[PDB]
Amino acid sequence: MTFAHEVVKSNVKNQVLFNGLTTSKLRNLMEQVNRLYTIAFNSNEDQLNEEFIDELEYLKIKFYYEAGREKSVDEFLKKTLMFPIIDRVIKKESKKFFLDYCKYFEALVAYAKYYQK
Amino acid sequence: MTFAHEVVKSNVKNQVLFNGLTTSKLRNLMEQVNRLYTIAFNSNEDQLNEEFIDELEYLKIKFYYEAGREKSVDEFLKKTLMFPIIDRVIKKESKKFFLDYCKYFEALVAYAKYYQK
Amino acid sequence: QDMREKGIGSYVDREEGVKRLGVVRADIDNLGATFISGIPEKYNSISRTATLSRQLSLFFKYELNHLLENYQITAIYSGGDDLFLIGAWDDIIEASIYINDKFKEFTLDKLTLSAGVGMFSGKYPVSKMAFETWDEFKKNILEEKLLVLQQGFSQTDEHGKAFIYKMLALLRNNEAINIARLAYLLARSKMNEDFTSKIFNWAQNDKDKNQLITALEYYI
Amino acid sequence: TFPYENELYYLPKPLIKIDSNHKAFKKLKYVPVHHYNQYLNGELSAEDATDLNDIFNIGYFSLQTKVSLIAQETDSSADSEPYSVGTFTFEPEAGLYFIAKGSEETLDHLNNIMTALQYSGLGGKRNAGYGQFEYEIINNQQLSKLLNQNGKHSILLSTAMAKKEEIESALKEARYILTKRSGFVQSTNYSEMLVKKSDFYSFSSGSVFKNIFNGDIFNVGHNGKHPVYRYAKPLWLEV
Amino acid sequence: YSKIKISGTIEVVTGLHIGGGGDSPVVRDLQTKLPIIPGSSIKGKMRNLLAKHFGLKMKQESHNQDDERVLRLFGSSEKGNIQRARLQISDAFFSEKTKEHFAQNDIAYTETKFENTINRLTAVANPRQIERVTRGSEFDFVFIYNVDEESQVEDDFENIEKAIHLLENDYLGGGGTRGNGRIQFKDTNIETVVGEYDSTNLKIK
Amino acid sequence: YSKIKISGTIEVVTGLHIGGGGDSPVVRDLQTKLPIIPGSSIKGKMRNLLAKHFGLKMKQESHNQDDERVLRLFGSSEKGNIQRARLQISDAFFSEKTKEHFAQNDIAYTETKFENTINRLTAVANPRQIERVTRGSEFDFVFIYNVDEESQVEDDFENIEKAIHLLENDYLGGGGTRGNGRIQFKDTNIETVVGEYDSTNLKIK
Amino acid sequence: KEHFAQNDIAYTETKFENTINRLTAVANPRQIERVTRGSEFDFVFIYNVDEESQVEDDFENIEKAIHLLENDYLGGGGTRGNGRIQFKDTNIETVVGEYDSTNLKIK
RNA sequence: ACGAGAACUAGUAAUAAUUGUCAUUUGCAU
């Protein structure tokens, strides 16, 4: 897939990144995603427990909070389809798709970090 | 592309190597490479798993991230044609070519390890 | 300490190297011509060929006895142009070199010797070891490469037969990937930069690497 | 038996009196079929002798070590008794070959027996894993030509011994080597160690003769329940 | 003459370092590139600890002449009173169940834990790195026991029970005192593979 | 010949930062991806403290040759002396009670702690991020004691209880001077797992 | 041969070993070479049936022998954990004479 | 009726032993 790859090169303008996105501005999101990663990894079955569903709900809440806090994060989340992807992940309730999302978002962050001021 | 393996001797300047590359900074890459070398080696057929294709995608992700973290690693990766060969190996999806890349990369690592401060 | 004659194991049990035997055979290359053709057209009497015969005979029937003194070797059959000596591995090589040089002295570098030395285990039927059996070897192999190698191992311990045998494993398979691997191994060793550098430069060259193989094999 | 390589076939050196080194020819044993008439007529040179010797790599020798633990190592503290065997190995295009002659019926029988034999051995420690073979019958034009000449001398290609009443006229002008041929026998009397053929001498496989002699299958038998045969019949090469 | 096969799996509790290669890597099969436990390791550790169980004198320390019945189980055949060995310890190989497990959940087959050394009067640290086999790995082992004397089966299996139990409270490989290489045995099995001997009354915890 | 087991629990008082694997991560297993306390760390720390309690000279500080009784307790086998270790320490693993507790109270396992340096005559900060094991978590340990001789067991466990007290008032891990690494010991249990020795009069605080 | 060449596997493994002295605990290492796992050897046996009425008995004996070798070792150090072999792909054919062999059996 | 025929280069022992991923450095100037 790696739409992250060509998207990150589509967002290099004149230089600002996503209108000035920086790696310090995604720390909380990275922490939350990492904790959900380790918790889901600890899980055995593929069916997502209702508690992990509530974790995903709070994760959605946190994306929305951060996107309301800053404009560049809002543009990043909007164009990278984070919100639609999270909605679909919540709909599917499958662990493997959540891990695939984790890998995608990690790639996004890695590209954003490699292209910086 | 073997000139890309012996460029390492052409890059002994004045004394630091690759502008201060150390094999110690290559550890995560070496670990991942060994992991998937073992996994591929046990595999029977030449056609790689689609999950193995995603694994190779994860390799490129990690390579870019490491190139972002350190500048010497960035120079090493960029000028030795690591990124194009990774893409090409992903393109042919054949086991023997993946092993060919593994031998090239291991030769790089060992020969670089020959010279260190 | 015991003057009584002892068995073939009396040379096997040397601890300075593997417990094996050495056997050496040598023939004068230009001897058929020398007794027959001799000195052309002006010195070909009975007298002068007779004195040449006597000189070769006395050389092989006294000079060997004296030359072999400092060596752990027993003399089996010697005379005419046949040289058959058996003893300890290292000692046979050293005595063979000494004898070749001392012969080239006495023949004023006119006659050459061809010789073969092999390693034979103790208690083999000697009838069977017999049917199995210069400047280059002395100057290039023994004097330079062997000496630097012995100094290198003497200075740096922990280089047991394991490290040397991994060196062999890399060397005998003549491949470039093996050259990189050998570079890694020498890098992981703790020899002085001079020793490692010399070994690697020799390893890059076919003639030098064969000579290096022979020299380190002799080390063991 | 006479060895071969990839496409070269070999016969032994005739012990013929060549008048010139007397060194390069001594170290030589076999002369291939290409240059054989050249050898018989002096068309072989010393450098050619060196070259032919150089090309003669047709197998190598070895000693394999073995141990025998049937002894009291079964019972109690008792040393093993290592022994040695001598072996020869041929490169992937070497072997040995025969030359046989007789009636057509005799050769058909020989074919049947050879088919039987290819899965038995032809050597020593057959039962311990040495010496099986596969055979092929090929008709080589040149060897046939060499065998079907006509001359005055004769080159003995096998091991023969003339009968009692022909040897005096057989040995008129000859060059030959005798070989004490000995060995034990298989299933004659109770003790193998007690049974051993009487020694027999026969001419070697390169001798040269003026007057042909036919041979005979000579008994080397005594103190036995059945006759034991030794073979002495020549296969002559006439040139 | 009968032979009894003993089968099971070894589960790694804490990381194991056999590592006969010497950086500091572990022994690996050259056909699968996976870690192995050489059978010499099992035989030697059982030898040593079950020897130290019984009498082991200084004169006994000197010669590797050990207790008569441990010697019977493992064989000496060195001097004088010869005894051919009786328990054949095979190697252990990385099981396919755990292979599927770690492949599916994407877990490395080896960790490289980094360790340090604080020397005294200087407090200067010099690092080192060690490879160790990941826990939860499972190795499949086979033992073969030969019945050279019928009446001695019970005592011999009693002693090998002692051996298994004592080994579960000890280590394999190196760095044993540093945490490494504790193992447990699980899903054992006894079955007569050759002969006319019953092996129902037999058990190995 | 017997082996006496010690089992218990490390309570994490303030943060704990081993970080052998390294923004600057901590040591973690790979079968559960939950942190551990390597046994080498515990063993080294106790050895250092208990050595310091006894005599320690500069020449003794030279090449890690330590007082004879601590040497006996932890093994040297270097100065031509026969000393294999008598006390085995294993790793500590993030316990089940902790996992359940943090799951049902919704608290993470690791804190990411940001640190700065203020340059002299410069007043400019260079930030750092240090990740540490969260407080109040508990890890479980197991130790093994070997009785090479009968008449030093009481004395050796007196030494070990002294050492455990010293650890209870010291730090294990990294950056312990700056407020992370204090630990406590609870639920000590003493059994003789293999042998015929009594574990009733023997105690560790 | 072809499998090891393609996957680039050497034909011999070398295991490092070690010995522990008692009262001393100094280790003296050794170096023993070993044939690689998974290698295959092709073999041929011959049975000269000199008695018709005994082939069943003799192949019963050779069956029991091969069964024993299956559960045993070849070569040295088998008590120490090496030498275990397996037998696959056995075929029995009559190559001389007119004796039937479509009923004889070897695993 | 082959200088043959009998004959496991076998038995004993492992990578061990001591090493802490540490030692300083304000989430700081409005």
Ligand SMILES: Nc1ncnc2c1ncn2[C@@H]1O[C@H](COP(=O)(O)OP(=O)(O)OP(=O)(O)O)[C@@H](O)[C@H]1O
């Ligand atoms: N001093 C001598 N005078 C005469 N003949 C000698 C003398 N020394 C040796 N020989 C001859 O050398 C023979 C030995 O032959 P050998 O095969 O050993 O070597 P060679 O054929 O003489 O040497 P090459 O072929 O190298 O010239 C003896 O049998 C003898 O005839």
